[PDB]
């Protein structure tokens, strides 16, 4: 028995669920690595932790990274070794930040939460009034734990004069006391089996709606308490676990003193009170003095737990309320919220976005200096892999040398090593995307053309955040989850996310523009090469309507691009566009004056038929073509172009 529990003790993995409950005294004792015997964490004269102190490294773990407290041993050759001269180990000094301690309370103290939190957990379990339960716990009212032969009842609030009179009257017939150990025993006495059975019997007997509902709710609460299985006796803390010496550090402040969270001072005071109480128990103090010391230790524990919530917060020399451990887990100060509120990160930078019209959809314009700022450790690793780096400091110097060898190695490392990039604001998930980063000599963030709207900003100077996906899983995620091309459609609307506009649309319309009596109207071009020559040589105007053999490679019932070659009267510019037109779209899908609406419609057809990758290729080609045709379109806007209406005056 209990040796196969080690098998039941699974291997190191991810807990599917989190078990949160009340540690039993043994649970805390195991959770600790010693029992304290000194209220001072550190010795002020030895500049070292006090023996049996809150910082007591021998209790709390290695004070030196690989060096003994006794100094009889040191170095990494002896990490984690127990010295008789020392009684400590030599694992990393975080061991003193690791091993914990215990403080075995002589009398258990209820969780300040267990009562103070309304509804009082203990109170709801005891089903008793708040003041009576407190005066019990606060040693301010005797509670007849059991009357036995005497007329007293069970867990019934009484008076000290009443308690004394009853004691005189009954000898040893009854069980009554003032304190919290009584409530602890009552929980230990509460037969939740018998109590729940009686509650169910009463609820069945209770025919009144209110009485039945109350008995049923009590039975349900008792059933929940049983199902949790948390020992109701564990509701009172009979031992004080200690934070690690560094977890509760008495940090040596400027001037030889020790700076600590006020919880540490509360712990020191509670330790002093507990030591006094232990001496009293050893010395067999008067019961009045014993009760006073017990109340004092209990109050010290309560203050160390949650100052101000119960009683008055111990105001230090600065008179501020004491920092209890609850405060450390209270609010955004509790690491949940304030950490989740904000976190500036590394492997990332901010620089103004530049419109890198040259780059492909995957390509990214990475400030080469900023690039250097980035893969600097990656660069050092490459150079060591290049063997040239023998010392990391030397690697830093060669980086400082900014070597062409360093520059070449950077060019190598950059190869298909895309890392995260982001453009504020975080409106749509498309607002942040990575790209294949190619170093650009300087300090500008060159960006792809159509990525504008998705980046949720404009070229008005957005400093952009670019995180480094160093991890291979993160790199595979940059390739698959952050694949910008894999963000083709509207996440919210499904629609294409990069539909054409403006300059590309301008060139598109220009090529789509047709002229009457143009430069060589009514000719025959065999195909895109022929018209490309004619206009590129200037033999014809781009806006010339001409018939050209259009090889309409059109997907069959099996999807095969069944060509339908035919000389079709179309535009020279339209003819040129048909070259950009992929095999699988209608000639009429381009054989007309086309614009940003038409461009978007064609793009949609491409996403449909051409799927993803062919559509993306067609898109990149279309972008380059639109920029080129717009530049060649050689048109501007003139102030004279603003032809005011002729009869505007007559209308007025």
């Amino acid at each position: 028995d209990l040796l196969k529990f080690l098998k039941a003790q699974t291997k190191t993995e991810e807990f599917d669920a989190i078990k949160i409950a009340l540690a039993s005294p043994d649970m805390i004792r195991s959770w600790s690595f010693g029992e304290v015997k000194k209220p001072e964490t550190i010795n002020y004269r030895t500049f070292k932790p006090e023996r049996d102190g809150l910082f007591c490294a021998r209790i709390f773990g290695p004070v030196k990274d690989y060096e003994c407290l006794c100094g009889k041993y040191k170095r990494l050759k002896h990490r984690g070794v127990i010295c008789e001269k020392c009684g400590v180990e030599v694992t990393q000094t975080k061991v003193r930040r690791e091993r914990m301690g215990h403080i075995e309370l002589a009398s258990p103290t209820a969780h300040i939460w267990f009562l103070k939190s309304l509804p009082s957990r203990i109170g709801l379990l005891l089903d008793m009034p708040l003041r009576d339960i407190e005066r019990v716990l606060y040693f301010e009212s005797y509670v007849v734990i059991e009357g036995g032969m005497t007329n007293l009842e069970r867990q019934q609030i009484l008076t000290e004069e009443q308690y004394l009179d009853a004691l005189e009257e009954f000898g040893d017939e009854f069980d009554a006391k003032m304190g919290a150990e009584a409530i602890q025993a009552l929980l230990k006495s509460m037969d939740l089996e018998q109590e729940c059975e009686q509650l169910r019997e009463e609820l069945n007997e209770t025919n009144s709606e209110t009485k039945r509902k109350k008995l049923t709710k009590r039975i349900k609460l008792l059933e929940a308490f049983v199902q949790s299985g948390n020992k109701p006796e564990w509701m009172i803390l009979t031992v004080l676990p200690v934070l690690p010496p560094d977890l509760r550090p008495l940090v040596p402040l400027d001037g030889g003193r020790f700076a600590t969270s006020d919880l540490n001072d509360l712990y020191r005071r509670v330790i002093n009170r507990n030591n006094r109480l232990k001496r009293l128990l050893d010395l067999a103090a008067p019961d009045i003095i014993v009760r006073n010391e017990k109340r004092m230790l209990q109050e010290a524990v309560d203050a160390l737990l949650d100052n101000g919530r119960r009683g008055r917060a111990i105001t230090g020399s600065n008179k501020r309320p004491l920092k209890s451990l609850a405060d450390m887990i209270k609010g955004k100060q509790g690491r949940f919220r304030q950490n989740l509120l904000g976190k500036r990160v590394d492997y990332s930078g901010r620089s103004v976005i530049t419109v890198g019209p040259y780059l492909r959809l995957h390509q990214c314009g990475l400030p080469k200096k900023m690039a250097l700022e980035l893969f600097k450790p990656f660069i050092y690793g490459k150079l060591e892999l290049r063997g040239l780096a023998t010392t990391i400091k030397a690697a830093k110097k060669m980086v400082e040398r900014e070597e062409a060898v360093v520059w070449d190695i950077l060019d190598e490392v950059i190869r298909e090593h895309p890392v995260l990039l982001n453009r504020a604001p975080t409106l749509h998930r498309l607002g942040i995307q990575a790209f294949e980063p190619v170093l650009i000599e300087g300090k500008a963030i060159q960006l792809h053309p159509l990525v504008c709207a998705a980046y949720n900003a404009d070229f008005d100077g957005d400093q952009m955040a670019v995180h480094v996906p160093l991890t291979l899983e993160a790199q595979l995620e940059a390739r698959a989850l952050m694949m910008s091309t894999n963000n083709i459609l509207s996440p919210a609307n499904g629609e294409p996310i990069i539909v054409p506009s403006q300059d590309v649309v301008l060139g598109l319309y220009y090529m789509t523009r047709d002229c009457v009596n143009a430069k060589g109207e009514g000719m025959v071009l065999t195909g895109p090469k022929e018209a490309e020559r004619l206009y590129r040589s200037g033999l014809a105007s781009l806006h010339a309507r001409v018939k050209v053999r259009i090889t309409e490679y059109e997907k069959d019932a099996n999807g095969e691009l069944v060509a339908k070659t035919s000389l079709k009267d179309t535009t020279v510019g339209r003819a040129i566009l048909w070259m950009i037109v992929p095999k699988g779209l209608p000639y009429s899908i381009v054989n007309q004056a086309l614009g940003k609406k038409a461009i978007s419609k064609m793009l949609n057809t491409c996403y449909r038929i051409l799927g993803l990758k062919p559509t993306v290729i067609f898109a990149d080609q279309i972008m380059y073509t639109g920029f080129a045709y717009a530049a060649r379109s050689g048109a501007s806007v003139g102030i004279d172009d603003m032809v005011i209406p002729e009869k505007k005056h007559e209308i007025i």
Binding site: V352, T354, V355, G442, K443, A444, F459, D460, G461
Partner: protein
């Protein structure tokens, strides 16, 4: 609590660079794209480079 104060003004020349923010009178603002080569600027009929 202070014995001396040595104020040293750090004068650094600021040259232009692609990516700088520039603007014009009639609402025309923008960001310095890049210093295109001389051949890149279109040529006027009088051979004037823009």
């Amino acid at each position: 609590g202070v014995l001396k104060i040595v104020k040293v003004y750090l004068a650094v020349k600021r040259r232009i660079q692609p990516g700088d923010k520039m603007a014009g009178r009639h609402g025309n603002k923008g960001v310095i794209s890049k210093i295109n080569p001389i051949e890149d600027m279109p040529y006027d009929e009088n051979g004037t480079p823009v």
